[PDB]
A paper describes a structure:
Here we applied protein engineering technology to target virus-encoded deubiquitinating enzymes of two viruses with significant impact on human health: Middle East respiratory syndrome coronavirus (MERS-CoV) and Crimean-Congo hemorrhagic fever virus (CCHFV). This resulted in the rapid identification of ubiquitin variant (UbV) inhibitors that bound with high affinity and specificity to the viral deubiquitinating enzymes. Strikingly, coronaviral PLpros also act as vDUBs to suppress host antiviral innate immune responses by targeting cellular Ub-conjugated substrates. The CCHFV vDUB domain is located within the large (L) segment of the genome, and has also been explicitly implicated in the evasion of host Ub- and ISG15-dependent innate immune responses.
Conversely, structural studies of nairovirus vDUBs revealed resemblance to the ovarian tumor (OTU) domain family of DUBs. Similarly, crystal structures of CCHFV OTU were determined bound to CC.2 or CC.4 to gain insight into how they selectively block the DUB and deISGylating activities of the viral protease. CC.2 and CC.4 were bound in the same orientation as Ub.wt with similar buried surface areas of ~1000 Å2. Interestingly, substitutions in these UbVs were concentrated in the C-terminal region and only substitutions at position 68 and downstream were found to interact with the enzyme. In both UbVs, Tyr68 improves hydrophobic packing with Thr10*, Val12* and Val18* (asterisks denote amino acid numbering of the large segment-encoded protein of CCHFV), relative to His68 in Ub.wt. In CC.2, residue Leu70 projects further into a hydrophobic cavity in CCHFV OTU formed by residues Val12*, Ile14*, Val18* and Ile131*, than does the equivalent Ub.wt residue Val70. The conformational freedom of a Gly substitution at position 74 enables the C-terminal tail of each UbV to form numerous favorable interactions with the enzyme. Residues Gly75 and Val75 of CC.2 and CC.4, respectively, occupy space on the CCHFV OTU surface, which in the case of Ub.wt is occupied by the side-chain of Arg74. This alternative conformation permitted by Gly74 in CC.2 and CC.4 allows the side-chain of Trp76 or Trp77 of CC.2 or CC.4, respectively, to pack within different adjacent grooves near the CCHFV OTU active site, with Trp76 of CC.2 forming a cation-π interaction with Arg92*, and the amide nitrogen group of CC.4 residue Trp77 forming a hydrogen bond with the side chain of Gln149*. Conversely, Trp71 in both CC.2 and CC.4 does not interact with CCHFV OTU, but instead packs into a hydrophobic cavity within each UbV.
Author numbering:
A (entry chain B): -1 to 76
B (entry chain A): 0 to 162
The structure:
Amino acid sequence: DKMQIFVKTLTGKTITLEVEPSDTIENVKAKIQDKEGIPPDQQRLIFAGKQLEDGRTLSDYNIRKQSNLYLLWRLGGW
Amino acid sequence: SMDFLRSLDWTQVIAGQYVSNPRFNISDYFEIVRQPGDGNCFYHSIAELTMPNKTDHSYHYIKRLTESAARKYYQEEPEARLVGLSLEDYLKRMLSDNEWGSTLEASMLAKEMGITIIIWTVAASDEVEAGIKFGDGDVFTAVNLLHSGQTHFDALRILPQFE
Ligand code: NA
Ligand SMILES: [Zn+2]
């Protein structure tokens, strides 16, 4: 069930992720940490105007193959 | 190059939050008004740009506005989800001295104060990596902050020759 999605970061880079529909948002944040080093608790993963929640899967958000997502993160804070 | 700031292209990512990735050097377009690195510099920076006759203690007012903003907006702020505290526990930490402000407080203050806040972020360089904008105003009416390093904020003012 492997597929890819595209994630555009706050700093303008487009990265390609290898994911499955059953992957959770936390799983996706872990993949992003491996590639870009951003801690998951700092990540704000966004699809179609909605910030995605830990505990849900890509399937729940109707995130199909070749979807385009945004990755923001916190600037500052504890 | 003199009209560059009029050309910025903002993309809405979530309600009221926009991003841009223009290629420019901060000091080419902005005066950088340095703030103390005392953990309060998010709020010092907003104070420099919103409070006349700003001092090292103006930030207390901005933090009280942040408390008012949070009582209205914290529960529904998407970035508040990453904090994971109830409103009251968030407020106790936020109001403590030397606790770092962030993009979360920028979002809430923009609504509370009726202003647009832009955070420009750089990494060990004059080169802009990104701007994130809270509110629908343009760079010429916004409160422009400089985020550098991990948690440091300074204030920015557009240089006169670009007005
Ligand atoms: Na925010
Ligand atoms: Zn004081």
